[PDB]
């Protein structure tokens, strides 16, 4: 918070993005604890292969990684909980030697000492429903998300390159996550300070017989501010070449441009944020 701000960035896990940070916590000396969001799904493989398949035999085509029910969520606010006032708390991770286990989760660690902040990466850093707020425990709050259409290619290609006997087709995995998408995942994209939005300017009409993802340079994001104020779009249509304003509050930006523009708009908040905790 205030004296132990976390960032929480939701929507998103390519994963560009990571290295973005780090590039900028290092170039502004900001000591920095992360967590992954896979480290709280609430299932490892087996457990949760095996939750699906108890599901579709109850009449259950509605049960994915996206829903809440699949998530440590209220640990996850327990730890955002946690390192705002202290500046402790844990992580695992999954997605690495201890053992290991391709499939398991490693074991918590306790969260290292002396940081600025907290950063987390996944799709639950904004969930606000009727048993866990966490969009209120993050001083900073940033969406990054395909159109929906680039989503499922992107899925898709992450399932045609890891089968198994799973007698589940792309059509039904992409459906039975709809579900859980609408309801969990679409509603914190209002939470959020701000989105950027990776728009394909090339066909996704038909997601499936997608042969490749859409690259950066095959896509514009969109990046739309909650709030507009302080924010000088004209420095920054002049320093990204080939924005524009789509928007009073959006710039749309070339896709191959998205870590220069995250540079650019977020050296300054982690800033004013790393400077209001030592004041």
């Given amino acids: 918070s205030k004296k132990h701000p976390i960032i929480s960035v939701t929507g998103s896990s390519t994963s560009t993005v990571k290295h973005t940070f780090d590039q900028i916590f290092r170039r502004e000396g900001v000591k920095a604890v992360s967590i992954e969001g896979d480290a709280f799904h609430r299932f490892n493989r087996a457990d949760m292969k095996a939750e699906l398949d108890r599901r579709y035999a109850a009449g259950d085509a509605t049960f994915s990684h996206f829903s809440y029910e699949a998530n440590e969520l209220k640990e996850l606010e327990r730890v955002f909980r946690?390192?705002?006032?202290?500046?402790q708390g844990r992580t695992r991770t999954y997605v690495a030697r201890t053992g290991v286990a391709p499939g398991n989760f490693t074991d918590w660690r306790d969260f290292d000492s002396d940081s600025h902040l907290l950063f987390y990466e996944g799709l639950h850093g904004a969930v606000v429903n009727s048993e866990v707020n966490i969009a209120g425990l993050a001083d900073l709050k940033i969406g990054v998300v395909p159109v929906i259409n680039?989503?499922?290619?992107?899925?898709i290609h992450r399932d045609r390159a890891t089968r198994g006997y799973t007698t589940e087709?792309?059509?039904?995995?992409?459906?039975?996550?709809?579900?859980?998408?609408?309801?969990?995942?679409?509603?914190?994209?209002?939470?959020?300070?701000?989105?950027?939005?990776?728009?394909?300017?090339?066909?996704?009409?038909?997601?499936?017989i997608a042969r490749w993802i859409p690259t950066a340079d095959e896509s514009v994001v969109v990046i739309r501010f909650r709030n507009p104020r302080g924010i000088d779009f004209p420095y920054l249509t002049s320093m990204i070449h080939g924005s524009w304003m789509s928007r009073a509050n959006s710039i749309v930006v070339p896709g191959n441009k998205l870590d220069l523009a995250m540079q650019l708009i977020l050296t300054p908040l982690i800033d004013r944020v790393v400077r209001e905790s030592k004041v």
């Avoid at 946690?82 to 500046?87: A, F, I, L, V």
């Avoid at 680039?150 to 899925?155: D, H």
């Fill in 150 to 155: 680039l989503e499922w290619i992107q899925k």
């Fill in 82 to 87: 946690e390192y705002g006032e202290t500046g």
């Fill in 169 to 208: 087709a792309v059509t039904d995995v992409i459906l039975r996550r709809m579900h859980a998408y609408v309801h969990c995942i679409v509603p914190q994209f209002s939470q959020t300070d701000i989105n950027f939005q990776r728009v394909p300017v090339v066909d996704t009409s038909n997601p499936f």
